Amino acid sequence: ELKIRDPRDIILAPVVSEKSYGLLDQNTYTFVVKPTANKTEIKIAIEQIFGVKVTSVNTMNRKGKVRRTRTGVGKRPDTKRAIVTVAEGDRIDIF
Amino acid sequence: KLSAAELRQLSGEELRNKVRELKEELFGLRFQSATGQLENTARLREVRKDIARVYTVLQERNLNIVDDP
Amino acid sequence: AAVCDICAKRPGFGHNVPWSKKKTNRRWSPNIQRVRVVENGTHKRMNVCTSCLKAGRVSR
Amino acid sequence: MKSLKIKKGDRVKVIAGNDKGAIGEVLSVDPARERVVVEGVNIRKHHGGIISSEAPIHVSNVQLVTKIDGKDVVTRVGYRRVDVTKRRPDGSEYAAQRSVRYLKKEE
RNA sequence: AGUUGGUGAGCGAGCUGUGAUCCGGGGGUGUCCGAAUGGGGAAACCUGGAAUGUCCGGAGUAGUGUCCGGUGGCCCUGCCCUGAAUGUAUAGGGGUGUGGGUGGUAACGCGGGGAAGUGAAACAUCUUAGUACCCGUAGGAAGAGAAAACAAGUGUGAUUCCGUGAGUAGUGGCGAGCGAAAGCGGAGGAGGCUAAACCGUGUGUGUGUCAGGUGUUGCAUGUGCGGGGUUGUGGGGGCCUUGUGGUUCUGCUGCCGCAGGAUUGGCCAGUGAGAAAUGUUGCGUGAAGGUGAAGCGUCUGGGAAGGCGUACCGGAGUGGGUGAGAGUCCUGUAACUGUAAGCGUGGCACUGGUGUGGGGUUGCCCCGAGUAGCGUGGGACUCGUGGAAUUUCGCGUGAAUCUGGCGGGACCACCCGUCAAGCCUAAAUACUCCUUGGUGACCGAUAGUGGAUGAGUACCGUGAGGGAAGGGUGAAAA
RNA sequence: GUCCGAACCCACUUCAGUUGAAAAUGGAGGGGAUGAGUUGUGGAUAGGGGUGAAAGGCCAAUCAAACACCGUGAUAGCUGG
RNA sequence: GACUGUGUGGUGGAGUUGAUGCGAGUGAGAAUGCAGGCAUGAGUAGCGUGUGACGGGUGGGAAUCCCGUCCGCCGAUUAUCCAAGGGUUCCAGGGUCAAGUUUGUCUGCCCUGGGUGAGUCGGGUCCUAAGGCGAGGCCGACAGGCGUAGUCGAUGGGUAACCAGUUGAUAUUCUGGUACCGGCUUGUCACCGCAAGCUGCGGAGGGACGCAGUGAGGUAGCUCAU
RNA sequence: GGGAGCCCAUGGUUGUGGGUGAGUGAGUGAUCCUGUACUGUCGAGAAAAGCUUCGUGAGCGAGGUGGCGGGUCCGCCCGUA
Ligand SMILES: [Mg+2]
Ligand SMILES: [Mg+2]
Ligand SMILES: [Mg+2]
Ligand SMILES: [Mg+2]
Ligand SMILES: [Mg+2]
Ligand SMILES: [Mg+2]
Ligand SMILES: [Mg+2]
Ligand SMILES: [Mg+2]
Ligand SMILES: [Mg+2]
Ligand SMILES: [Mg+2]
Ligand SMILES: [Mg+2]
Ligand SMILES: [Mg+2]
Ligand SMILES: [Mg+2]
Ligand SMILES: [Mg+2]
Ligand SMILES: [Mg+2]
Ligand SMILES: [Mg+2]
Ligand SMILES: [Mg+2]
Ligand SMILES: [Mg+2]
Ligand SMILES: [Mg+2]
Ligand SMILES: [Mg+2]
Ligand SMILES: [Mg+2]
Ligand SMILES: [Mg+2]
Ligand SMILES: [Mg+2]
Ligand SMILES: [Mg+2]
Ligand SMILES: [Mg+2]
Ligand SMILES: [Mg+2]
Ligand SMILES: [Mg+2]
Ligand SMILES: [Mg+2]
Ligand SMILES: [Mg+2]
Ligand SMILES: [Mg+2]
Ligand SMILES: [Mg+2]
Ligand SMILES: [Mg+2]
Ligand SMILES: [Mg+2]
Ligand SMILES: [Mg+2]
Ligand SMILES: [Mg+2]
Ligand SMILES: [Mg+2]
Ligand SMILES: [Mg+2]
Ligand SMILES: [Mg+2]
Ligand SMILES: [Mg+2]
Ligand SMILES: [Mg+2]
Ligand SMILES: [Mg+2]
Ligand SMILES: [Mg+2]
Ligand SMILES: [Mg+2]
Ligand SMILES: [Mg+2]
Ligand SMILES: [Mg+2]
Ligand SMILES: [Mg+2]
Ligand SMILES: [Mg+2]
Ligand SMILES: [Mg+2]
Ligand SMILES: [Mg+2]
Ligand SMILES: [Mg+2]
Ligand SMILES: [Mg+2]
Ligand SMILES: [Mg+2]
Ligand SMILES: [Mg+2]
Ligand SMILES: [Mg+2]
Ligand SMILES: [Mg+2]
Ligand SMILES: [Mg+2]
Ligand SMILES: [Mg+2]
Ligand SMILES: [Mg+2]
Ligand SMILES: [Mg+2]
Ligand SMILES: [Mg+2]
Ligand SMILES: [Mg+2]
Ligand SMILES: [Mg+2]
Ligand SMILES: [Mg+2]
Ligand SMILES: [Mg+2]
Ligand SMILES: [Mg+2]
Ligand SMILES: [Mg+2]
Ligand SMILES: [Mg+2]
Ligand SMILES: [Mg+2]
Ligand SMILES: [Mg+2]
Ligand SMILES: [Mg+2]
Ligand SMILES: [Mg+2]
Ligand SMILES: [Mg+2]
Ligand SMILES: [Mg+2]
Ligand SMILES: [Mg+2]
Ligand SMILES: [Mg+2]
Ligand SMILES: [Mg+2]
Ligand SMILES: [Mg+2]
Ligand SMILES: [Mg+2]
Ligand SMILES: [Zn+2]
Hints:
With 60 residues, chain C is mainly beta. Chain C is built from one helix and four strands, in the order ββββα.
């Protein structure tokens, strides 16, 4: 079958913000993931990508903001973000 | 370089390795874009185009449009 | 029933026509009879019109 | 859609507008809306700072110019078909037919 | 030779001619929902495969959670097994996956159901109108169609459509209204199959059949398949006088004849409705393209296409652009050309595939049955039940079958026409959601589509549904 | 299906409001308040039909036959232009 | 006469005049006409229950913003937390055209960025009620009606976690401490064997049920305290 | 774990490290718990699963499973402002 599936298709981008950097103090990383991926799949993908033991994965769905402009209401895409908790010393480099 | 019809001179397993390497490069590019790096933005689309090309070659081989090496 | 399982005879539609000719819609149903049949080897009921029953197009 | 008869790098003469008779090189072509930029003709300000540079003018307001006998003469163009060979993306060869522009008033 | 869509620029690229963007054609990918189809569901969500090695294949983990792909909706139908109560057997059950279906669609088609407002100066018959709407169901068109026809004294010769006939003859609470046909003039122009006798081919069963022949030779019913046959001043079968395409030379009928036979003629006939449907070669092209003529000088002007002067092209002076009004600045136009490709398409050759009757004859045999008629209750025909033909539905009743049936406006006789109760048929006709080109004593932003802009949007309504308004700087953002 | 009385449900009187705070309310009192009570969620009944401890009541703020669209540019011996 | 000048300016920036024909969406003051713009009433009524005062700050601008102090108000609710419904209004920073019945430096407004973490909470993966749909099926000219086997459907049944702390914005979710439930796997002990077990399938038990009332034993809470 | 005012200091509408001190008794008392208890009563007050147990109208399944304490990892989707 065509279309090999890579674990990097699930993990889209890291979330960079004050809360994410504060969570880095707890070995916690916030990633924007594919909105159809469950916690187990995200955990396995993170493990395979980074060679890092993951203790916990917490996910939330975030609604996109709606703003009224010329041409009416626009709606930013919905996102799901996984909050991955890493083992005591493993560390993930997001650059 | 952006890959071309010389992908038809490769084998199935190394074409699949090319797919995996392209996916990993795209992963790195997306992370750089999120983190504020990646001045070279055109590569972020060209890597996806290359993935499309490799899948095109694989599917033509699988469907026997082009004889498989 | 008003439809024959053989020949598909179905009701007609026309008029009640009184002395004053004040026409009203009405129906003419076929004389459908429900009889026991043995087709090939199958025992079953069938709604059969009296015309087919008289012609013998139904096996009892 | 196809291209225009005037291409970048050509030497053309302005035949209409505030700069009739001006001769310059075609700096850039905008085929979609048929406007070209010729050096040292339509000097106006952009934006950014001042940027005193050339503004596009309509392609029909310029004409290819040739030097026949020491005087610049505006000329029209024609095309002739010449046998060429084109390479398919894989690199194979095949003989095909291509058009080449020539200036009139000089054969 | 530029290019990474638009509203709406500069980054970072590719093309830096290794020819991109772009254009035509053909593929690849195509999340989720939707007939939606593994199961469920509040459409775009959820959830799965009893226990076994796991539904099957792959990936991952020590292992389970997991991932990727495949598979199984329902109904009809084909094939195989089984056969209930129960005996035959069927229903049913278990396989197999053979085929088809589901839903959508602007108008036009066919079949069926079927209003009311309205008009009649009320109103019920009638009208509106078989309209609106609705149900079923197509096709590129459909329906109809090869005389159980018209005609009226000769004749016409399938159907459909157009013009007349004619607002006539008629019909009508003879009110309001409704309203033909023949004939004639045109568009377009085909006719073909079948059922039945009769002859070849099995099962509820032989004891009568010169080479041959046995209580049966091949004898009796009625099947499924072949021929044969298809018409009306009757035809066909049968019975015969002949005729099949030149034969290798097989059985039967009679050591006459009949049929299978085989490369080869072959009048022919063909992808059509025509009892059928399978490759190679000859044409112009549609989708893209290619070529495509011929002007300068001065004047005023921000700007020349305007003025003045003076030349040119024209199979091209239709347009539209360009800083103002351009035949020669641009796009094109005329004319010619290319089309590789198409599922290409149309036509031709070939290939390939399929194949005769005429005359006489009545003695017999066959010629479409719950049909045609008749009665009755309704419908359509100019015809509103009538002198009511013709045609149609429901319910009864129910024929002849050639010395016969039906039609010619009740009916009967004669005469003339025709042969129903089986089927298939192109063209002329209807239509435009769409595609391409073109047009307008058509509109020009309160118009023209509701909609020149985020328009079936904003907004209103629980919902079906309703439903707007807002265009213009300049030649160039300078 | 007792009594008094909050919540709750109701709506008898009065005043105010009546271009309202409100297309039916507010202030003051008033009836029921263990019952034929009241209330939440989901569901069922549909237009000559539903439902009605019955007032022609109610069925999405005007019901002696809802609303929407269609027949439709209904018709009007009437009124206006 | 409808109207008009081949008079003369201004504005304006691309068309259009006369003759003679031809064709009309060809003329408006009325329709409680339609659309838009704008008057009249009029700087008039109103500004939606109420208690604010002051000191300081910010600012171009302060009764109406911020801080503080007095004072007043609610408190079976003017408090706190859910469901339904809403949908980013939440937080931080920038803003004062519009919106806010005034002002506004302020906002539930605008702009930009950020914010919602669950094996246990509430739903699904479990269960059914009313009711819906419904393989076959029966009924009905067509369209359809009903319904079996089933399959859905909470407002009910079933179901394992608490306290503390932390952020500008989250918390039975994160963190700390200490638990519990179901799997997988593993160590060890004990036990089976027409006759292990597992999964299906059902039987039974159980789940499993009204209203009203009194009393008793407790605890939460509250009050007081030498 | 939580819980006040004392600290060179902090920083001056601020939080840090120490400084946390007490946990006792009586009264009163629920709409909560025992409790679907108990008593009274007519109007006679869901279903199904989970659950316990029983077999076997089905298959799987090896002589391997099923139990009791101990250890490791796995625990999904939606909501959460
Ligand atoms: Mg969550
Ligand atoms: Mg978007
Ligand atoms: Mg009628
Ligand atoms: Mg009888
Ligand atoms: Mg190419
Ligand atoms: Mg060219
Ligand atoms: Mg390309
Ligand atoms: Mg599905
Ligand atoms: Mg479904
Ligand atoms: Mg499927
Ligand atoms: Mg299994
Ligand atoms: Mg269909
Ligand atoms: Mg009537
Ligand atoms: Mg009338
Ligand atoms: Mg009248
Ligand atoms: Mg036809
Ligand atoms: Mg003929
Ligand atoms: Mg004719
Ligand atoms: Mg036959
Ligand atoms: Mg030219
Ligand atoms: Mg000129
Ligand atoms: Mg006949
Ligand atoms: Mg007759
Ligand atoms: Mg009759
Ligand atoms: Mg009639
Ligand atoms: Mg008759
Ligand atoms: Mg007669
Ligand atoms: Mg036909
Ligand atoms: Mg308009
Ligand atoms: Mg205008
Ligand atoms: Mg307007
Ligand atoms: Mg709405
Ligand atoms: Mg009482
Ligand atoms: Mg209340
Ligand atoms: Mg009252
Ligand atoms: Mg009053
Ligand atoms: Mg009382
Ligand atoms: Mg309902
Ligand atoms: Mg009354
Ligand atoms: Mg009402
Ligand atoms: Mg009525
Ligand atoms: Mg009408
Ligand atoms: Mg009128
Ligand atoms: Mg009047
Ligand atoms: Mg005129
Ligand atoms: Mg007018
Ligand atoms: Mg006016
Ligand atoms: Mg107005
Ligand atoms: Mg005024
Ligand atoms: Mg005053
Ligand atoms: Mg006044
Ligand atoms: Mg006053
Ligand atoms: Mg006042
Ligand atoms: Mg007030
Ligand atoms: Mg105030
Ligand atoms: Mg204050
Ligand atoms: Mg107080
Ligand atoms: Mg109190
Ligand atoms: Mg929410
Ligand atoms: Mg915001
Ligand atoms: Mg908002
Ligand atoms: Mg806020
Ligand atoms: Mg204001
Ligand atoms: Mg502010
Ligand atoms: Mg703010
Ligand atoms: Mg289930
Ligand atoms: Mg049920
Ligand atoms: Mg069914
Ligand atoms: Mg179930
Ligand atoms: Mg459920
Ligand atoms: Mg909060
Ligand atoms: Mg907490
Ligand atoms: Mg914790
Ligand atoms: Mg039980
Ligand atoms: Mg019970
Ligand atoms: Mg007590
Ligand atoms: Mg939350
Ligand atoms: Mg909250
Ligand atoms: Zn019948």
